[PDB]
Design a protein around this ligand. Sequence first.
Ligand code: MG
Ligand code: MG
Ligand code: MG
Ligand code: MG
Ligand code: MG
Ligand code: MG
Ligand code: MG
Ligand code: MG
Ligand code: MG
Ligand code: MG
Ligand code: MG
Ligand code: MG
Ligand code: MG
Ligand code: MG
Ligand code: MG
Ligand code: MG
Ligand code: MG
Ligand code: MG
Ligand code: MG
Ligand code: MG
Ligand code: MG
Ligand code: MG
Ligand code: MG
Ligand code: MG
Ligand code: MG
Ligand code: MG
Ligand code: MG
Ligand code: MG
Ligand code: MG
Ligand code: MG
Ligand code: MG
Ligand code: MG
Ligand code: MG
Ligand code: MG
Ligand code: MG
Ligand code: MG
Ligand code: MG
Ligand code: MG
Ligand code: MG
Ligand code: MG
Ligand code: MG
Ligand code: MG
Ligand code: MG
Ligand code: MG
Ligand code: MG
Ligand code: MG
Ligand code: MG
Ligand code: MG
Ligand code: MG
Ligand code: MG
Ligand code: MG
Ligand code: MG
Ligand code: MG
Ligand code: MG
Ligand code: MG
Ligand code: MG
Ligand code: MG
Lengths: 271, 46, 93
Amino acid sequence: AVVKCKPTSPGRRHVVKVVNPELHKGKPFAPLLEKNSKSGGRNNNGRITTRHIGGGHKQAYRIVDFKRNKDGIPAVVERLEYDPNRSANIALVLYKDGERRYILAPKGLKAGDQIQSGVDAAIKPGNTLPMRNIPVGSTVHNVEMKPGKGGQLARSAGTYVQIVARDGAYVTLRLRSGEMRKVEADCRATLGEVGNAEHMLRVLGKAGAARWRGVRPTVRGTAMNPVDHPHGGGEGRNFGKHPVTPWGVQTKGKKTRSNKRTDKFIVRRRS
Amino acid sequence: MKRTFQPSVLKRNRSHGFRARMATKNGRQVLARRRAKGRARLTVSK
Amino acid sequence: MIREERLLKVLRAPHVSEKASTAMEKSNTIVLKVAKDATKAEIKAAVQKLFEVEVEVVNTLVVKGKVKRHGQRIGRRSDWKKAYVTLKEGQNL
RNA sequence: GCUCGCCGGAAGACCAAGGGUUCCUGUCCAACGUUAAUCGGGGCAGGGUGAGUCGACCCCUAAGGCGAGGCCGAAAGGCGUAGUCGAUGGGAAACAGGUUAAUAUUCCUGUACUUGGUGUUACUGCGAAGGGGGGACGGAGAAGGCUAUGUUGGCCGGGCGACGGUUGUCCCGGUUUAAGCGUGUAGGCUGGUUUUCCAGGCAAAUCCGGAAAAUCAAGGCUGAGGCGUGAUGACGAGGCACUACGGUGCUGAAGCAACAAAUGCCCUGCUUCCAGGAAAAGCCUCUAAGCAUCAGGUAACAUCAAAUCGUACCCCAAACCGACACAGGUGGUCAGGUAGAGAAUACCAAGGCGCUUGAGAGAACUCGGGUGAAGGAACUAGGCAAAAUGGUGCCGUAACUUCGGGAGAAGGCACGCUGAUAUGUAGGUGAGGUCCCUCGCGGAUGGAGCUGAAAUCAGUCGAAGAUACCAGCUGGCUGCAACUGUUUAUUAAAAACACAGCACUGUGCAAACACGAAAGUGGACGUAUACGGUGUGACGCCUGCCCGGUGCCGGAAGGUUAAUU
RNA sequence: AGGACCGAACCGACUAAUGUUGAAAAAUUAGCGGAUGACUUGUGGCUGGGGGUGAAAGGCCAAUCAAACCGGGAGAUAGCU
Ligand SMILES: [Mg+2]
Ligand SMILES: [Mg+2]
Ligand SMILES: [Mg+2]
Ligand SMILES: [Mg+2]
Ligand SMILES: [Mg+2]
Ligand SMILES: [Mg+2]
Ligand SMILES: [Mg+2]
Ligand SMILES: [Mg+2]
Ligand SMILES: [Mg+2]
Ligand SMILES: [Mg+2]
Ligand SMILES: [Mg+2]
Ligand SMILES: [Mg+2]
Ligand SMILES: [Mg+2]
Ligand SMILES: [Mg+2]
Ligand SMILES: [Mg+2]
Ligand SMILES: [Mg+2]
Ligand SMILES: [Mg+2]
Ligand SMILES: [Mg+2]
Ligand SMILES: [Mg+2]
Ligand SMILES: [Mg+2]
Ligand SMILES: [Mg+2]
Ligand SMILES: [Mg+2]
Ligand SMILES: [Mg+2]
Ligand SMILES: [Mg+2]
Ligand SMILES: [Mg+2]
Ligand SMILES: [Mg+2]
Ligand SMILES: [Mg+2]
Ligand SMILES: [Mg+2]
Ligand SMILES: [Mg+2]
Ligand SMILES: [Mg+2]
Ligand SMILES: [Mg+2]
Ligand SMILES: [Mg+2]
Ligand SMILES: [Mg+2]
Ligand SMILES: [Mg+2]
Ligand SMILES: [Mg+2]
Ligand SMILES: [Mg+2]
Ligand SMILES: [Mg+2]
Ligand SMILES: [Mg+2]
Ligand SMILES: [Mg+2]
Ligand SMILES: [Mg+2]
Ligand SMILES: [Mg+2]
Ligand SMILES: [Mg+2]
Ligand SMILES: [Mg+2]
Ligand SMILES: [Mg+2]
Ligand SMILES: [Mg+2]
Ligand SMILES: [Mg+2]
Ligand SMILES: [Mg+2]
Ligand SMILES: [Mg+2]
Ligand SMILES: [Mg+2]
Ligand SMILES: [Mg+2]
Ligand SMILES: [Mg+2]
Ligand SMILES: [Mg+2]
Ligand SMILES: [Mg+2]
Ligand SMILES: [Mg+2]
Ligand SMILES: [Mg+2]
Ligand SMILES: [Mg+2]
Ligand SMILES: [Mg+2]
């Protein structure tokens, strides 16, 4: 559900919120919860290594099963849940032997639905199979890059991967970026799209809403002095130079990928 | 107004105390310099 | 059991003041100066063995030595321990 | 000592931090104290800090620190594993009265509570470094039940008034009591019990999770406050006998109800929202190795233990941070009366103070204020400053608008006191009595007593009734920035910065990028609906032409071209 | 409901006067802005000098900042006074 707030105050005028009625209103499953304090973008030297990070709401980490390696035990979806740590929603599933787990909730999945993993799983959304057993043309998500490592590709809200080809031991995947990549056919994938496709229709509306998510203000380079940015300086608004990062690398079109180890797997760049 | 010195005994001992000096070779060199000068008070400890 | 040598060492002096005398009268309590490291149990055992009276409780405090200016030089008297020894209402030490 | 004045959400009281004897007593007045000093936070001397329950220490962890081995690095060293530290957080237990010149939840009196070690008895499956439950957690809002507390009445004791009245519907004062134990309430959550089974909880489990049936329909957990006991005790206004005038001591009445009522408690509750809200131990439970009539566990009684350290005093300040006995700064708690929406404000209570130079005079001028004829911005860079407006209820309110606003637009009327309605109304609170039952801190009825707005009418005083304190000036046109925010600590608060939104661009995850000779770390326990960089800056309508120059992206025929040979 | 409204505590600092060998090496008085939030505050911790940190003023990093402080090279050099 996408609903616009009424302009009863200037900070509310442009707010557009995503409210999902189905989401659980209670507390999360306690044994599947771990704490994680914030870093502020600071590394173990105590230096800011990533700017514009800090503050925001306290969050508990939910242990999500990206591996999906209970083969042959059917599971039932108990309830959808809000996960602060990611854009997608998650589903708390109960296994027939009494094990409870969190999974990425695919589009369409709801309470009472059955899911299953393994080679003999039925082709239906939320089921996990090796891509050997998944037909060419299927839409999948939570794609493994190595067998047994856990899904790593297409995990954000509303994303998915298209299985384009299958030759030998490798499948050709079409990624959200447009890149065509090769991954091993033993790698597991989950049928269907990631849910919460309406997540991109949100409008924060005010600066405080970005602050609630741990995002600190960005200061433009041209607004500062030359001592601390190549864009700095000037009597009035002056630029006269090719745009660069704070460290001097050109930031409009220059390419930065340098990985000859994984170049063999890239069928075509995203263009 | 609020001034620069705002005393805390715990912070004082953790910053300049005897154990803090002993924990690094540079602090041990501070202690050697102060012993060689003949200082009655080596650190802020007491 | 605490050793006899320790008991002979712990007790130092009886404290003489009007508060101590009021303790002796009102509450049958003697006030002593003891060693800085003399515990309550050692004080009780030493009073019983060395003053031959029955004790039911001792109370202790540490007195901080004062700072005194003697000939413009700065000095500090030593800290000492003081004991309030209650005799169990039948002794009259 | 008697008056006077000042603070009283503090200028009173208690703490933490910080200080360290400044605390109390005697004595002294050189120096110190912005003057004197007989006085002092000054000199000198003596005295003073009493704990199983308060805190530390202790058990347990957060951020973070250190870190055996380890990985890395010319050396020095960096990071990090197992671990081990680290509160600002979790974890056993005490209250009231009395007492010193100076301590007291520590001493004394009374009445309690916690944990541990032993000893005996009786029953008996005990046991972890492991499994599980629990601890255990956000913001906002609403209502009910309470209590602290206050007011009035009743009750007790005392009074009969320096000037007209004051035996009464008069005046003054008191009317207090804890923890614990018993009760299990207003209320909150949740269906129980019993069989059998199981791809789960690293092994196991009767424990937790799941599955299938029977049976019953009330069980369990939590819970302020009240009541009873504690307590025939203590305290108590006042009386009495001495005084060192400070006080010593004896006795000591009544000690009830109603009403109002928190920002405190029930409540870590309930409702709701999105930004989705510590950890670990104590604690309960389950077993494994193991022991296996032993040990150990449980229940009762006895008895012993609870150490050490802190404890004086200041603590919005003359004792801390400011070189000062300095108009500065400094976290938490307590929270009376009248009026008031109020922790504003005025006047007061408890309590605390008059700020460590005074005495005169009554010039100019300076500072801070009061009032002002006639005029009313003529002043000036500029209405700077000042003057003015100011409350509640009701009526009434334009352009424009993103339909929310604009708006308290503007403007206007009423406003005190007395009586009546109504010997106190509508409402709120609620006793006695009666009726019922799964019988009590129960249900229903009944409404005495108490408390008590708003309105209308009539009358009445003053120049003036939101009378003091307190408490919006309003309107028209226009530049800039959408807006709330941020900034040059100490001459600039803005049109500057940020901002939601927009766009370009990079990035396929051992991501790009950043900090690092490195190992690693952040990005992120994220995965293109993501993350970084850059510019623009809500929203509406839009965003034209140029790739010659510079940059970037792509291409590789040809020219040129390094080490090398 | 709200980076909603009026307004104390609390956080700030727009105007004026005083003060300028100050009561004060940045305050006082009267007015002024925010006041449930991008709020404010206590305790503890981390980031170190061509480095940090910065809603960006070359601001801030112990009354010191277009390169902190302390010690050292060091009696730097000074065609200048
Ligand atoms: Mg960024
Ligand atoms: Mg931005
Ligand atoms: Mg600038
Ligand atoms: Mg440059
Ligand atoms: Mg220009
Ligand atoms: Mg130009
Ligand atoms: Mg002294
Ligand atoms: Mg004194
Ligand atoms: Mg004299
Ligand atoms: Mg003098
Ligand atoms: Mg003195
Ligand atoms: Mg003690
Ligand atoms: Mg005792
Ligand atoms: Mg840690
Ligand atoms: Mg080592
Ligand atoms: Mg380390
Ligand atoms: Mg520890
Ligand atoms: Mg603590
Ligand atoms: Mg005292
Ligand atoms: Mg009451
Ligand atoms: Mg409040
Ligand atoms: Mg005290
Ligand atoms: Mg003075
Ligand atoms: Mg002062
Ligand atoms: Mg303050
Ligand atoms: Mg006031
Ligand atoms: Mg007054
Ligand atoms: Mg005059
Ligand atoms: Mg004048
Ligand atoms: Mg005037
Ligand atoms: Mg006039
Ligand atoms: Mg006139
Ligand atoms: Mg006029
Ligand atoms: Mg003019
Ligand atoms: Mg003129
Ligand atoms: Mg003005
Ligand atoms: Mg005025
Ligand atoms: Mg113009
Ligand atoms: Mg603006
Ligand atoms: Mg503003
Ligand atoms: Mg500021
Ligand atoms: Mg300035
Ligand atoms: Mg300014
Ligand atoms: Mg990584
Ligand atoms: Mg701009
Ligand atoms: Mg613009
Ligand atoms: Mg253009
Ligand atoms: Mg507001
Ligand atoms: Mg405003
Ligand atoms: Mg002011
Ligand atoms: Mg306001
Ligand atoms: Mg500049
Ligand atoms: Mg400075
Ligand atoms: Mg330099
Ligand atoms: Mg040289
Ligand atoms: Mg020289
Ligand atoms: Mg020359």
